[PDB]
Write a protein that binds this ligand. Structure first.
Ligand SMILES: N=C(N)c1cccc(C(=O)N[C@@H](C(=O)N2CCC(C(=O)c3ccccc3)CC2)c2ccccc2)c1
Ligand SMILES: [Ca+2]
Length: 223
């Protein structure tokens, strides 16, 4: 996250870290056994870390659970990032409390101008690199689809939305990928991609989770 703030320990309790000997992506807990993340975060041997604040110190509240299954949407296209969504099943159910909790899925799509919360342990710089120990947060609005498409001509599908500041200065970034965009208590986006981070007229682009609710529910039902 570039230009955001320290969330505070366990204030975003659905936020997980995907680890492969190091933090590589975020994810969102949607029930005790399943996490939503980006398909471009796929890899074998994922370890899901729930209840994290500082990802480098065991502080208490952590739960480390191996992924038993990592399911990339079947129409995911790595060239375009269309359908950039992945479902991870945990080997054992996480224990849910106030520091580890699920985030509800949307019952409808969100509208342009709605304010959302985006978080992660990704790069905090727009130039160069700096990775934080503690979870960072950023409040950002959903942009209109016309402004989204003018910023990224021919690259925005109906399964994507832009959010952030046309700005420069405040955005998600590498390392935050797969992580949540939560708006009025619903998981409406997945950190997916953008040109650089926090650059003027290049806002973040997020998977549009309201288009995948039936797919998530059927995939979970079958697995
Ligand atoms: N800012 C966000 N909100 C955000 C969030 C999460 C990751 C990234 C991210 O990693 N940004 C890349 C970048 O410049 N690129 C451009 C094109 C994109 C791509 O190849 C593509 C492919 C198909 C369709 C659309 C885009 C791949 C990343 C990058 C490279 C070097 C330093 C910083 C950032 C950005
Ligand atoms: Ca920790």
């Amino acid at each position: 996250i570039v230009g955001g703030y320290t969330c505070g320990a366990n204030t975003v309790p659905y936020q997980v870290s995907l680890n492969s000997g190091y933090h590589f992506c975020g994810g969102s807990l949607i029930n005790s056994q399943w996490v939503v993340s980006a398909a471009h975060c796929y890899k074998s041997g994922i370890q899901v870390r729930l209840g994290e604040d500082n990802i480098n110190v065991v502080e208490g509240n952590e739960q480390f659970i191996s992924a038993s299954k990592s399911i990339v949407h079947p129409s995911y296209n790595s060239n375009t990032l269309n359908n950039d969504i992945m479902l991870i099943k945990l080997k054992s159910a996480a224990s849910l409390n106030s520091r580890v909790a699920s985030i509800s899925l949307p019952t409808s799509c969100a509208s342009a101008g709605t304010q959302c919360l985006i978080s992660g342990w990704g790069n905090t710089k727009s130039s160069g690199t700096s990775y934080p120990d503690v979870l960072k947060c950023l409040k950002a609005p959903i942009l209109s689809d016309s402004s989204c498409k003018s910023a990224y001509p021919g690259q925005i599908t109906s399964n994507m939305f832009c959010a952030g500041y046309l700005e420069g200065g405040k955005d998600s970034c590498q390392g935050d990928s797969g992580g949540p965009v939560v708006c009025s208590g619903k998981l409406q986006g997945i950190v997916s991609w953008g040109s650089g981070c926090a650059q003027k007229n290049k806002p973040g682009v997020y998977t549009k989770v309201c288009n995948y609710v039936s797919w998530i529910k059927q995939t979970i039902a079958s697995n």
